[PDB]
């Protein structure tokens, strides 16, 4: 779940 | 395995009710990832209705023990101890999606038998409610009296409401 | 009916676990007999394992309300609220047969749900234990501390022991 | 029959959970006794855990309709609608025995199906809670806000506390 | 009723397992018959497998209390507390039919929970075994050590053997 | 497998009720690790509600037999025999996390059948309670009388309280 | 009642499996009828599959004790102890209808537990088989060896065959 | 697999109730190990409540047949046939841990049906009790009469007591 | 009672499956009516699916024994032993209504256990099939070979067909 | 797999009740081993309570069809068809361990429905009993009449007795 | 009894599903009323869902047999055989209330087992459908083909539609 | 896998009741083997109680479709459709072992609901019985009338009898 | 249910 | 059920 | 069941 | 339950 | 059950 | 249970 | 199941 | 179970 | 769960 | 479980 | 329930 | 199921 989770 | 793939990138999925099994698995993964790299943060994705209090605290205590910062993402629903765990994420790195739901409430339990035994169970759960509420207060910034009141009954919150309450820090959008 | 015959001679039989039905029947009979003759004493024969606390107190309160003196006879076993009712008999007129058994203990109950609800139940049963122990103390002559200690766990007593404790006044022989 | 004997002396016994059957019987008896003598008061002995709201109101409405004044006696336990009925007794003639227990709380119910259907059920039970609370307030003297607060969760009261609250007018002793 | 007819002639039938209900009925009948005529003996016909210890002692204690002599007849089978009751009959008036069966053994019970609770149960039943064995010894003439040994396991006896043991005094023939 | 990975680093996970299966596995792992290196300490992570007494002692006896020092970490909950095992860890190396819970109590069991059989069971469990309490006393420093009293009923302890009691030596923080 | 009418004419109906209840009833009726007139014979109609051995012997012993001669009629089926009772009728007055069925076999039972306990049960039932077989031999005229052999397995007999065997004396026709 | 690893070092684990499956597995393993090296001793670790008599004897007979000496270690509990197997270990090589528990008793079984069938079962189990008791006597050194007496009821023994009795030869400590 | 009224006019109703209870009742009624007037015929109304063979023969044998002629009327359905009984009515006086249904077939049963026991059951039911078929042949006029063939499987017959077969003599109309 | 290892050395394990699955497996293994080497003998280890007759005969027929000689070893218990299979081993190569148990008896079955259907079942099982008994006779040397008599009821035999009977040829010792 | 009162005025109530019991009662009542006065008509009130075909025909055949004319009134619902019975009322005297409902359909049944047995059942129910349809045709005036078609599936009719179809003759109004 | 090994040598095992799953597997294997080599024959080993008719025909139709000749071997039991399949094997290559059992009978089924629906089911199963019987007739050489008669009820046949009937061509011996 | 049944 | 049973 | 039982 | 109910 | 019980 | 209850 | 199946 | 099976 | 277990 | 099992 | 039903 | 499916 990136930007930013990763 | 899709989840094993997420673990390779330091992502742990808590997507089921929390029981001792789930708890031990999450704890092991946390210790494992922390062992591989005590620097890179870890991401705990949450979509759980909650579960055992001692199980959740096992996870919570491990989140705190390890050096890596643990960020939490509420996807779907984060209720009860799941919500507690979400709020436990590294300050500033607690997220939720636009339509996520976060529900906080007081512990559930049972007591059977003699008055003395019922009293033993009563003191325990009441003590647990306090321990949890205090942490929630520290993590959210809300005063204890407020947490105590707001968790008296099932309290469902939207991501916007979770943000305003101090349970999360940011809502992921696009 | 054999029991209806005993009622004709002012004898009520409490020979089953105590539930609201039994309790209402006993209460009605007591009021009935008291209505027919507020002078002649009434005899309550007891052989019960006990039952509902509110049911027993309904019986107890009625025993106290009516003018006739209520004597109690333990035949077989008088446990829990049954024992309480035996002790409640008119002072000087509480009997037991040679091999009767009398057992006193603390209330039994249950609590399910939220900590708040478990606490509600806890306070209630603990309050009931006190109310009961206090009456037992008055009725026996034992100090409250002694009743509280002796009823912590199932306490089985012979008729001789029940007499020494102050639960009964005399053992029927021949 | 022991109860049929009590009926001969204008005493109705509500000593079981309240369901339509119990309710229809009580109502019939009330109308019957009122028919025989619209002057002599009637006594409603209560030892019930409560039951159906519409069943209780059937009894309540009949208590109000008939000319004879209906006195209520709480023997054992008067919970939920039973407590409501106790409070509904003729002002000044509402009694309870020394160890009686009185418990007041909010209505219980259920809703299944579509959101629209759940909403129908919700509005009904919420409306009923208000209708009941308002009557309790009038009968006790407590302001509505107080009744609403005090009935939020199971509220167990001793006879002394029921008296102080305005649920009963006198405690029967000897 | 055939049994009600037997009662008219001072004959009580104990032909079912012994439970509190049966016990209370037998006790009432004994007291009743003794009230009608404290002189005429009473006959207790036994064909029972036994049952509750406290229930049997209720019967036993009543047999001893009343003035009338109670004779016992074993018809069919007299096992456990039933055998005890047979042996309890008036010395010299304890009978059995040619093919009757008499079985004596030790008490049966159960314990669940904490070691402390199991111990409570253990002491009780062991105490009861002694109380029973002592009475058996007195009633039979056998020394306690003999009763203790012979009741260790189910001990089935023919009428002839019951007579030799001292459980009965005479075998009815023709 | 995540656990197999922990085993590679000398960490055994006791995170389920203790039954013969769990016990045999733990025992085998302990012997295995001790075989690979009788010098390197072993870590037993505990999050168990307890279980079979003979199963726990199998684990305990093995912990004592092997040369490697076994450290114990209470994560989540350590109740009954699990708490016993926690206390059994190498003195100075018994840990618990901040919100861990430790509960000590007396053995639970059952007895069915003849008085003699119930007595067999009673003596066994009472003997076991003593054997366990004695070890707990040695491991904690508390006198036996204290252990006996404190384990009479479910005794829940926080990590801070477990430390003060002598069940653990240190609380892991960060 | 149709049966009560038959009793008025000294006819007892054993038309159900034999259990203690049935047995006690039959026994009472036999004693009753014998009391009313120790001269007039009594008729025991049988249509039973059998039942308890001790229950049947209670009936058997009573048939022998009373003075009146008891004739037996097998209507429908007389199996197991029912057949035994049929054969026990007054010699010369044992009947069966044209299509009646008579079945004789050995006792049925069970044993559970320790070898010692199974042995106790074994000796009892084997002793009972002998006692029954001996009486059958006397009543039929068949030598014991023949009874033992013929009852090893379910042995169904027609009325003609029952007559030839000595179980009955005459077949009722018209 | 942890157990497969133990097998590689000639260690068989009997840690579950004994049924035909378990028995066949143990037997196969014993024959297997004996085939690989008829010289190196084999170790049978025991933590079993016992089970089928014929299953245990299958194991026993195999222990005797093979050349390798089989040593036995009681870890946890060794009851019934498990205790028998422990005692069956190579003389001088029968061990138990400090807190191991060893229980010896008589066979358990059941019999249903005809007296003849019950007798068949009775003779079998009684014969088995003897066969077992005789071997126990030889293996322990205790005279048969002593084994017969001591196994009449559940006989629980500590490791110290098992040693004194001759069931084991040495207690493993450190 | 409507049926008791029919009995007053010598009409017995067999309108349920035939079991020992029904059979004993019918038999008693037949004997009763025959006792009151051995001349006036009796009417047995039948609407039964059948039932026990021995029960039916009890009824059949009694129909034959008594002097009064027994006429049978099939109303609704007369199947299996009910049909047999219909056919057993007094020759010339066996009726059926226009839409009555009559079904004849072979006996139904079961056998469990050893080959020897199955054989015992087989011979019995096969013997019963013959006994029944022979009587049917006599009562109908059909040769045995025909009855055997026609009853091999459920054979449903209209009143017209029953008449042609010889099961009934006349169809009631108006 | 331990069993797969035994198969590598031509050993088949029949250690469970015999059903079509077990039977098909054994048969396949026998054909397989016979295919690999029609010379080397095969060993069938037996510890079974028996099972389906057609399943056992499938095994039996295959044992006979293949060239390799099949030796049988009774380990533990060989009952019913298992015993049959033990006896079916190559003459001279049928073994049993010292404490093995061998039980022979007659077939077990059931029949439900019409007399004709029960007869079908009866003839089948009786035919099977004969077919089996005849083979047993040939394999043991005992005359058919003897087999028929000795298998009438459960006949348990020790290894010594099995040897004397001709079921096995040798007892394995050491 | 309210119904017994209706019977006094020649009104029989068929207000439950039709089974043999109901059928026998109705039949008895019909014969009874016809006996008291073969002139006065009888009224059969119908509110039944239907039931057994043979039960209904028993009622039908009796309606036809007796002299009194039987009028039928459909109150509520008259389905299946109940509708058939309504149609069977005396021509010109078949009524229904304004909102009565009448449903006609084909017979319902079942068949299990062998093809031959299923065929037996098939022919029976198909024969019954025809017998019923033919009567319906006569009673309504509708040709058979029409009845067969219209009853193929559940055919619900209003009172107006039942009238037009010929099932009833008049609708009761006021 | 042992069966997969048999498949490698063109052997399919039908050793379970026949259901769609089994049928689809067998069909697939047949098509598979036929694809690999349309010349080499295939062997279908049978030990089945039968099953679904449509499932068996799926197998049958495939046996006929493929070029390779399919030989069948009855091992154990070949009943119902299994026997049908056995008979379906390539003429001259249908075998059975010495003690194999072959049973032929008619189809089994059920019908529930309306007469019309029952008729649908009846016609279907009766049609199937014919289709099957005709093929059996062709395969055996027996005239249809003979097959129809011999399959009316369960017809069990020995291998010798199956051979005489034309179901198999040869019995495998040695 | 009169007029007219009774 | 008369004429004629009774 | 008379003559003769009763 | 008098004085005063009744 | 007399002579003599009663 | 008299003398003296009643 | 050879000679001859296979 | 050798010597001699195998 | 190191520093220090391991 | 060595010294000495193994 | 009068005045007025009845 | 070939020739011809496949």
Q: For residues E129 and L103, what is the distance between their CA atoms, to the nearest angstrom?
A: 63
The 3 state secondary structure assigned to chain J is: CHHHHHHHCCEEEECCCECHHHHHHHHHHHHHHHHHCCCCCEEEEEEECCECHHHHHHHHHHHHHCCCCEEEEEEEEEECHHHHHHHCCCCCCEEECCCCEEEECCCEEEEEEEHHHHHHHHHHHHHHHHHHHHHHHHHHCCCHHHHHHHCCCCEEEEHHHHHHHCCCCEECCC
Q: For residues D41 and D52, what is the distance between their CA atoms, to the nearest angstrom?
A: 26
> Are the beta carbons of G173 and G122 closer than 8 angstroms?
no
Long-range contacts of D162-165 (CB under 8 A, 24+ apart): D162/D74, D162/D96, D162/D100, D162/D102, D163/D96, D165/D140
Beta strands in D18-169 (DSSP E): 42-48, 70-79, 94-96, 101-104, 155-158
Which residues fall within 8 angstroms of residue E127, CB to CB, at 6 or more apart? none
DSSP state of D51: B
DSSP state of B15: -
Residues followed by a gap in chain B, C→N > 2.5 Å: none
Query: G80 catalytic, yes or no?
Result: yes
Q: For residues I131 and I126, what is the distance between their CA atoms, to the nearest angstrom?
A: 9
Helix (H, G, I), strand (E, B) or coil at K19: coil
> Are the beta carbons of D38 and D66 closer than 8 angstroms?
yes
Count of CB pairs separated by less than 8 Å, J with S = 3
DSSP state of L90: P
> Are the beta carbons of D78 and D101 closer than 8 angstroms?
yes
F 34-93 near U (Cβ less than 8 A): 41, 43, 45, 71, 73, 75, 93
> Are the beta carbons of J100 and J70 closer than 8 angstroms?
no
> Are the beta carbons of K107 and K129 closer than 8 angstroms?
yes
Tally Cβ neighbours within 10 Å of residue K39. 9
Q: How wide is the angle at C-alpha L164 spanned by C-alphas L162 and L165, nearest 5°?
A: 65
> Are the beta carbons of E110 and F112 closer than 8 angstroms?
yes
> Are the beta carbons of E131 and E120 closer than 8 angstroms?
no
| Domain that includes residue H96, residue range | 1-174
Q: Is the peptide bond before O4 cis (omega within 30 degrees of 0)?
A: yes
List alpha helices for E9-151, DSSP H.
20-36, 53-65, 81-87, 115-140, 144-150
- How far CA E54 is from CA of B9, C96, C98, C173, E86, in Å, comes to 71, 13, 11, 17, 16
For strand E155-158 and strand F170-171, is the pairing parallel, antiparallel, or unpaired?
unpaired
φ/ψ (deg, to 5) at D15:
-125, 45
Beta strands in chain F (DSSP E): 11-14, 42-48, 70-79, 94-96, 101-104, 108-114, 155-158, 170-171
Helix (H, G, I), strand (E, B) or coil at L102: strand
Helix (H, G, I), strand (E, B) or coil at E154: coil
- Neighboring chain L residues of J117 at a CB cutoff of 8 Å: 153-154
> Are the beta carbons of L50 and L91 closer than 8 angstroms?
no
CA distance I99 to chain G (A): 32
Which residues fall within 8 angstroms of residue E128, CB to CB, at 6 or more apart? E53, E107, F115
Helix axes K115-140, L115-140, angle to 10 degrees: 150
Q: Do N1 and I93 touch (CB under 8 A)?
A: no
Give the count of domains, chain F: 1
Tokens of C99: 């091999």
- Neighboring chain I residues of O2 at a CB cutoff of 8 Å: 35
CA-based R_g, chain Q, Å: 3
Catalogue the active-site residues of F: 80, 105
> Are the beta carbons of C113 and B108 closer than 8 angstroms?
yes
Q: For residues B22 and B14, what is the distance between their CA atoms, to the nearest angstrom?
A: 8
Helix (H, G, I), strand (E, B) or coil at H91: coil
- How far CA J25 is from CA of E87, E114, G5, J13, L13, in Å, comes to 64, 50, 69, 10, 11
Query: Residue K65: in which H helix or E strand, if any?
Result: helix K53-65
Helix (H, G, I), strand (E, B) or coil at S1: coil
Residue whose C-alpha is closest to residue E167's, from J32, E61, E155, D8:
E155
> Are the beta carbons of L139 and L88 closer than 8 angstroms?
yes
D 48-77 near C (Cβ less than 8 A): 75-77
Residue whose C-alpha is closest to residue G59's, from E86, H114, E44, E100:
E100
> Are the beta carbons of I75 and I46 closer than 8 angstroms?
yes
Which residues fall within 8 angstroms of residue C103, CB to CB, at 6 or more apart? C77, C78, C79, C80, C83, C154, C155, C156, C157
Tokens of R3: 């003398």
> Which residue does chain C place closest to D75, by CA atoms?
C58
Residue whose C-alpha is closest to residue I159's, from I100, I104, I90:
I100
Q: For residues I25 and I43, what is the distance between their CA atoms, to the nearest angstrom?
A: 15
Tally Cβ neighbours within 10 Å of residue K135. 17
K 105-124 near L (Cβ less than 8 A): 105-116, 118-119, 121-122
Helix (H, G, I), strand (E, B) or coil at E9: coil
Q: For residues K124 and K118, what is the distance between their CA atoms, to the nearest angstrom?
A: 10
Tally Cβ neighbours within 10 Å of residue H141. 10
φ/ψ (deg, to 5) at L159:
-60, -35
> Are the beta carbons of G174 and G122 closer than 8 angstroms?
no
| Catalytic choice (D80, D100, D158, D174) | D80
Experimental method: X-ray
Residue whose C-alpha is closest to residue I166's, from I92, I101, I74:
I92
> Which residue does chain C place closest to R3, by CA atoms?
C174
Q: Do R5 and C73 touch (CB under 8 A)?
A: yes
Q: Is the peptide bond before I14 cis (omega within 30 degrees of 0)?
A: no
Q: Do O1 and G95 touch (CB under 8 A)?
A: yes
CA-based R_g, chain S, Å: 3
φ/ψ (deg, to 5) at G94:
-115, 115
- How far CA H33 is from CA of B36, E132, H28, H69, in Å, comes to 42, 58, 9, 11
> Are the beta carbons of L29 and L68 closer than 8 angstroms?
no
C156: which strand partners? C103
Q: Do J118 and I121 touch (CB under 8 A)?
A: yes
DSSP state of C101: E
Q: Do I154 and K54 touch (CB under 8 A)?
A: no
Q: For residues B22 and B20, what is the distance between their CA atoms, to the nearest angstrom?
A: 6
**CA pseudo-torsion sign A5, B3, B6, B10:** positive
For strand I101-104 and strand I155-158, is the pairing parallel, antiparallel, or unpaired?
antiparallel
Q: For residues B24 and F49, what is the distance between their CA atoms, to the nearest angstrom?
A: 14
Q: Do J10 and T6 touch (CB under 8 A)?
A: yes
DSSP state of L51: B
Count of CB pairs separated by less than 8 Å, A with B = 16
> Are the beta carbons of L37 and L7 closer than 8 angstroms?
no
Helix (H, G, I), strand (E, B) or coil at E92: coil
φ/ψ (deg, to 5) at D143:
-70, 155
Q: For residues D83 and K8, what is the distance between their CA atoms, to the nearest angstrom?
A: 48
**CA pseudo-torsion sign H104, H105, H107, H108:** negative
Q: For residues J8 and H35, what is the distance between their CA atoms, to the nearest angstrom?
A: 13
Query: What is the CATH classification number for the domain harbouring H140?
Result: 3.90.226.10
Which residues fall within 8 angstroms of residue F23, CB to CB, at 6 or more apart? F52, F55, F56, F58, F59, H15, H47, H76
Q: For residues K142 and H57, what is the distance between their CA atoms, to the nearest angstrom?
A: 83
DSSP state of L151: T
Tokens of B64: 């705190």
Q: CA torsion, points L18, L21, L25, L30, in degrees to nearest 10?
A: 50
Q: Do chains V and W have 3 or more beta-carbon pairs under 8 angstroms?
A: no
Q: Do C131 and D99 touch (CB under 8 A)?
A: yes
Q: How wide is the angle at C-alpha I68 spanned by C-alphas I67 and I73, nearest 5°?
A: 135
List alpha helices for E37-80, DSSP H.
53-65
> Are the beta carbons of I131 and I83 closer than 8 angstroms?
no
Q: For residues H28 and H25, what is the distance between their CA atoms, to the nearest angstrom?
A: 5
CA distance S3 to chain L (A): 9
Tokens of K139: 């009673």
> Are the beta carbons of D19 and D55 closer than 8 angstroms?
yes
Q: CA torsion, points E64, E69, E73, E78, in degrees to nearest 10?
A: 0
Which residues fall within 8 angstroms of residue F145, CB to CB, at 6 or more apart? none
> Which residue does chain P place closest to C28, by CA atoms?
P1
Helix (H, G, I), strand (E, B) or coil at I110: strand
CA-based R_g, chain I, Å: 16
Q: How wide is the angle at C-alpha I32 spanned by C-alphas I29 and I34, nearest 5°?
A: 110
Residue whose C-alpha is closest to residue F159's, from F149, F151, F148, F167:
F167
> Are the beta carbons of F46 and F81 closer than 8 angstroms?
no
Residue whose C-alpha is closest to residue J78's, from J56, J93, J63:
J56
Q: Do H172 and V1 touch (CB under 8 A)?
A: yes
- Neighboring chain G residues of Q2 at a CB cutoff of 8 Å: 35
Q: For residues L67 and L72, what is the distance between their CA atoms, to the nearest angstrom?
A: 15
- Neighboring chain F residues of E118 at a CB cutoff of 8 Å: 109-111, 118, 121-122, 125-126
| Catalytic choice (E71, E105, E158, E174) | E105
DSSP state of O5: -
Q: For residues B95 and B169, what is the distance between their CA atoms, to the nearest angstrom?
A: 6
DSSP state of D61: H
Would you call C129 an interface residue with chain B, using a CB distance cutoff of 8 Å?
yes
List alpha helices for L37-114, DSSP H.
53-65, 81-87
Q: For residues I148 and J61, what is the distance between their CA atoms, to the nearest angstrom?
A: 41
Helix axes K53-65, K20-36, angle to 10 degrees: 10
Q: Summarize chain K as % helix, strand, coil (round to 5).
A: 50, 25, 25
K73: which strand partners? K45, K95
The widest CA-to-CA distance across chain I, in whole angstroms, is 57
């Amino acid at each position: 779940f990136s930007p930013x989770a990763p | 395995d899709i989840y094993s793939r997420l673990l390779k990138d330091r992502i742990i999925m808590l997507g089921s009710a929390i029981d001792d099994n789930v708890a031990n698995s999450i704890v092991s993964q946390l210790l494992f990832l922390a062992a591989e790299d005590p620097e890179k943060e870890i991401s705990l994705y949450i979509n759980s209705p909650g579960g055992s209090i001692t199980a959740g605290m096992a996870i919570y205590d491990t989140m705190q023990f390890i050096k890596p910062k643990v960020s939490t993402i509420c996807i779907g629903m984060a209720a009860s101890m799941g919500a507690f765990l979400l709020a436990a994420g590294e300050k500033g790195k607690r997220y939720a999606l636009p339509n996520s739901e976060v529900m906080i409430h007081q512990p559930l339990g049972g007591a059977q038998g003699q008055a003395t035994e019922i009293e033993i169970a009563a003191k325990r759960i009441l003590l647990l409610r306090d321990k949890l509420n205090k942490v929630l207060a520290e993590r959210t910034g809300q005063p204890l009296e407020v947490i105590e009141r707001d968790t008296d009954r099932d309290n469902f919150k939207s991501a916007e409401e979770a943000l305003e309450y101090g349970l999360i820090d940011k809502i992921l959008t696009h």
